[PDB]
């Protein structure tokens, strides 16, 4: 049927009544607290909308309104970052001197001696040095003064206001019906063509008209005050012609397919701008133009109201083959009747995308004066890897929640989903094996090496100077990408990244990017990554495939998604639920990504980053110790953790002291987590009994009876403090180190 706007008017009357009725949304919670378990359950169930109401339409409306809420808080945050840039930063000083001045946009108040944290960051400014790369973003945007940031910040607060109103309006006042929400073809069309396509075209516009000219003048060493305001490039064409002659041709070459007339401001240079060590704005312009066209074309695929276009259901139903029975039949119903099926997908692939972004942004630094800002480089890579890893585990969680709650046998009979359930023992047994194989033939090589080195047998080690394990395939791919410009990418001048090959590119004294040579230490660490990813997948996939049932618990779907166990019987059934697989996958996600960011940190500091002599000799931050040290655990303990922790532990009485405190604080929160993970509810409830006795004895026993946390909450609190403590430790470590050496 036809995609159309159809809403109910005034579905939910706006009133503070329910604000004064905590747990109104759940029938069980509505009765009120009897024990302290109620207080936890309130927060635990708050956003679990499927348990509020059965009605999919009411759930869809709650989700749509909540999203306007989350867009509002993210816009408040982004507006705040830009406002702090406008008011409490050395952005204007940093523009004048990017190489010397250190980016800072957080000033601490003088109280209890914490003003020490306002260090000398350059540009006659005292504040906390920021590692979020906002200054490099704003320079890329072509922002050259505090007033432009103020305008952008205020604009953001108005957009955050609009997003709040939208969320209130689209819930309380004009709530779309389920019909509206289930127009997946129209949504994909509008999100591909407008959100991504027109967003990318719009941005190409800004790049071509504002960013490229302003950045070109700044790279030509023109003073920030002397550079014309971005509107002067539109109003005064002559200024723009002088930088990019192609604008002389006007818009006729676009309409007459004489596109070579724009070859000066729409380039395919490759490599990096040698002044800034970032990607060329003219390459970025052409990228966003090319992206925009491909998206606007792509988003005319799905049939809406005019017959032309694909129906996704028919595409899915037609993709079946002799191994997969009914193939992708019934998956359209899964993805259009379950929000959890969509959230699973979108978290899995947005998480995977965020990790791709992490890799692509370090190797091809897109912003001016990012590549040489080693603190920003390390921090944005690590940040986006972490966000990626959490989102992926979220994908798996909501995949398991779908399997328990929203999976229908009738819809999903002899389809790809049904058939994976029927060989899940074959999937998990094989994945179990490949995990053990990778574990032995990746980690076991480190243990072999540690032992050989310890026994004074370096000739018997797995190393470049001993038994070599050269990553020949990755080495071969690096070569192909290095030979690409002029060859298999004829109209490229440089490679996409200097990481693949070409020359050392240097900005100031420092290496922006150079070839990242792969050897035995790179082969070993890559097979550690493969191992730690395959084990995380084993846990999460086992979680999703065995969420509904197993050979142990046939009726696991009836027990639900999040239950602690089915009792000490059958030998003991602790942590069989899909929730408990997510819990265990988080530790393995944490273990996996920890080694990824450690790999990145050490490899970049030893083999890429460093100073460049006038002659052209590169002196690396840790002097290429990775090749010989990163092949033993002792080498990681000594030359990475021990060596590079010197800055964080020696930070007291300086501007980095905060990272020293965060480092210990995080070690504490991590250790605190072991209380929750190693212990059980039974002990704590019995201890609370005695404490409750003493409160009873003095007539201070609370009406809301104290209870030990639930078995599940114990685990949830455990893994929360473990991840917080562990990640925060590395965060403090990375900052204190890279803000000293980088």
């Amino acid at each position: 049927k036809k995609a159309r706007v159809i809403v109910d008017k005034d579905p939910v009357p706006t009133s503070f009544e329910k604000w004064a009725q905590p747990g109104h949304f759940d029938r069980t919670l509505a009765r009120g607290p009897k024990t302290t378990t109620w207080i936890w359950n309130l927060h635990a169930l708050a956003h679990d909308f499927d348990t509020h109401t059965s009605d999919l339409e009411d759930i869809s409306r709650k989700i749509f309104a909540a999203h306007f809420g989350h867009l509002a808080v993210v816009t408040i945050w982004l507006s705040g970052m830009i406002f702090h840039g406008a008011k409490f930063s050395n952005y204007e000083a940093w523009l004048s001197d990017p190489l010397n001045v250190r980016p800072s946009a957080q000033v601490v108040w003088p109280i209890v001696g914490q003003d020490i944290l306002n260090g000398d960051v350059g540009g006659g400014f005292h504040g906390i040095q920021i590692t979020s790369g906002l200054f490099q973003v704003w320079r890329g945007w072509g922002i050259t003064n505090s007033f432009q940031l103020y305008c952008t910040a205020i604009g953001g607060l108005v957009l955050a206001g609009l997003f709040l109103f939208a969320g209130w309006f689209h819930y309380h006042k004009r709530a779309p019906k389920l019909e509206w929400f289930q127009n997946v073809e129209s949504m994909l069309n509008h999100h591909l063509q407008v959100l991504l396509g027109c967003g990318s075209l719009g941005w190409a516009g800004h790049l071509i008209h504002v960013s490229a000219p302003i950045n070109k003048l700044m790279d030509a060493g023109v003073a920030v005050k002397d550079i014309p305001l971005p509107h002067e490039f539109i109003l005064n064409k002559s200024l723009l012609i002088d930088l990019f002659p192609g604008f002389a041709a006007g818009l006729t070459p676009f309409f007459t397919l004489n596109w070579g007339q724009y070859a000066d401001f729409l380039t395919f240079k490759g490599g990096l701008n040698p002044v800034t060590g970032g990607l060329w704005m003219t390459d970025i312009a052409h990228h966003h133009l090319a992206i925009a066209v491909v998206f606007i074309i792509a988003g005319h695929q799905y049939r809406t109201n005019w017959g032309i276009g694909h129906s996704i259901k028919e595409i899915l139903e037609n993709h079946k083959g002799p191994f997969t029975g009914e193939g992708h039949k019934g998956l359209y119903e899964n993805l259009t009747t379950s929000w959890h099926a969509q959230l699973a997908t979108n978290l899995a692939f947005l998480g995977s995308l965020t990790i791709i972004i992490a890799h692509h942004m370090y190797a091809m630094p897109p912003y001016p004066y990012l590549a040489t800002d080693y603190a920003t480089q390390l921090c944005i890579f690590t940040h986006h890897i972490w966000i990626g890893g959490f989102l992926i585990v979220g994908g798996a969680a909501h995949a398991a929640i779908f399997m328990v709650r929203d999976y229908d046998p009738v819809v999903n009979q002899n389809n790809v989903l049904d058939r994976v359930i029927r060989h899940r023992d074959a999937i998990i047994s094989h994945l179990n094996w490949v995990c053990i194989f990778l574990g032995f033939h990746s980690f076991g090589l480190y243990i072999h090496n540690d032992t050989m080195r310890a026994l004074g047998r370096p000739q018997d080690m797995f190393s470049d100077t001993a038994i070599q394990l050269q990553p020949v395939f990755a080495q071969w791919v690096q070569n192909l990408h290095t030979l690409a410009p002029g060859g298999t990418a004829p109209n490229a001048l440089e490679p996409v990244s200097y990481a693949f090959g070409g020359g050392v590119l240097a900005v100031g004294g420092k290496v922006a990017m150079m070839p990242i040579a792969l050897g035995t230490a790179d082969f070993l660490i890559h097979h550690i990554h493969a191992f730690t990813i395959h084990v995380t997948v084993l846990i999460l996939l086992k979680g999703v495939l065995f969420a509904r049932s197993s050979r142990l618990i046939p009726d696991k779907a009836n027990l639900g998604f999040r239950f602690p166990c089915d009792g000490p019987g059958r030998g003991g059934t602790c942590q069989v639920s899909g929730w408990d697989h997510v819990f265990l996958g988080l530790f393995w996600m944490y273990n996996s990504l920890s080694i990824v960011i450690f790999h990145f940190s050490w490899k970049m500091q030893s083999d890429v980053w460093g100073t460049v002599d006038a002659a052209g000799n590169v002196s690396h931050i840790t002097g290429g110790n990775f090749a010989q040290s990163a092949i033993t655990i002792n080498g990681w303990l000594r030359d990475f953790l021990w060596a590079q922790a010197s800055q964080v532990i020696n930070s007291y009485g300086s501007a980095l002291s905060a990272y020293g405190l965060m480092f210990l604080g995080a070690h504490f929160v991590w250790a605190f987590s072991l209380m929750f993970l190693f212990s059980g509810r039974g002990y704590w409830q019995e201890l609370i009994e005695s404490i409750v006795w003493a409160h009873n004895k003095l007539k201070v026993a609370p009406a809301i009876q104290p209870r030990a946390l639930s078995i599940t909450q114990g685990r949830a609190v455990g893994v929360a403090h473990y991840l917080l403590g562990g990640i925060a430790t590395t965060w403090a470590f990375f900052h204190a180190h890279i803000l000293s050496v980088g």
């Binding site: 064409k237 002559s238 002389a248 006007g250």
Partner: protein, 329 residues
């Protein structure tokens, strides 16, 4: 009719036809008024006025409005007052437009009294002659306003001696006016132009007065079709010719456009289409004011010719059947 052909729904009607056209007039005066101030603000005293993208202020400067000698332009106030007057005229016309559309009646069958008062029908050839009549009288008067501006209301700028001059000898004896049927677009003296608009005016009032008192002859009824689509097609044809002639005058004529306020020479080049490109290849930008007014109105004239053809093919009958059943046969 569909949404895209939604303005064809009030084609007949009465009140919305006045409203839609008085709105276009309000918009046209708003363009005339507001972009006067735009061109005043964008006009730099230095650099000759041709390449500054000015297509409105030169028209005022041609009428000898604060110019001086050799287009030096001392006074900007006369341009501002004209800009203000057309802008206030836009406001009252805009108010009058949305009155007749929304507030006023959507039919004039019982409003004014009769077809002579203000009502009209497309088929009836008596009141549409009266409308044409009074419109020719207004155009006739509008031509005599320019004659007024020439004779002693300031005088008009001449490119012969590059100054604002007062004409006091209009070119009578239409032996030269009939002479200018072949010697047109080579007008080199202002007395000939003034005498031209005098001859246009006195005949246009003479045409006007004749169209009101008399009804078209059965010869006219037999030849020309009295249909809203047909009279639109005749108008599209009339404007197309006007546009092509105006485009030619803009290109070749050196007096009616005083050269120093514009580029100066335009050569007719043909590749895929005819177009007046440019002379001296205007650098530091591209295309003079004259080049814009010549080409834009030529292309508009060509598309209005395609408008004549399209609407005239629908004028012979309805042709909404003959386009579809053209191939469905």
């Amino acid at each position: 009719y569909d949404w895209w052909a939604g303005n064809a729904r009030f084609a007949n009607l009465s009140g919305l036809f006045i409203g839609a056209h008085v709105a276009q007039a309000a918009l046209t005066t708003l363009w005339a008024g507001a972009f006067t101030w735009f061109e005043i603000s964008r006009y730099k005293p230095e650099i000759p006025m041709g390449e500054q993208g000015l297509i409105l202020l030169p028209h005022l400067a041609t009428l000898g409005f604060g110019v001086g000698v050799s287009g030096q332009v001392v006074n900007t106030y006369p341009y501002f007052v004209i800009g203000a007057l057309h802008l206030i005229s836009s406001a009252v016309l805009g108010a009058g437009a949305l009155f007749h559309t929304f507030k006023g009646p959507r039919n004039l069958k019982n409003t004014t009294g009769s077809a002579r008062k203000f009502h009209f029908e497309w088929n009836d050839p008596k009141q549409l002659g009266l409308i044409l009549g009074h419109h020719l009288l207004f155009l006739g008067m509008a031509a005599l306003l320019l004659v007024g501006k020439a004779m002693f209301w300031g005088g008009l700028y001449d490119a012969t001696t590059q100054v604002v001059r007062v004409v006091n000898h209009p070119t009578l004896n239409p032996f030269v006016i009939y002479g200018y049927q072949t010697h047109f677009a080579s007008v080199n003296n202002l007395e000939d132009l003034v005498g031209g608009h005098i001859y246009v005016g006195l005949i246009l009032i003479g045409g006007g007065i004749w169209h009101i008192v008399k009804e078209p002859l059965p010869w006219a009824k037999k030849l020309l079709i009295f249909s809203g689509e047909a009279i639109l097609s005749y108008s599209l044809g009339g404007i197309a010719l006007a546009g092509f002639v105006a485009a030619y005058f803009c290109a070749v004529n050196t007096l009616a456009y005083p050269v120093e306020f514009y580029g100066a020479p335009l050569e007719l080049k043909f590749g895929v289409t005819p177009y007046f490109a440019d002379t001296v290849k205007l650098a530091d930008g591209g295309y003079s004011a004259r080049a814009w007014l010549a080409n834009a109105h030529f292309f508009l004239a060509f598309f209005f010719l395609q408008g004549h053809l399209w609407h005239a093919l629908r004028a012979i009958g309805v042709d909404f059947r003959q386009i579809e059943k053209s191939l469905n046969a």
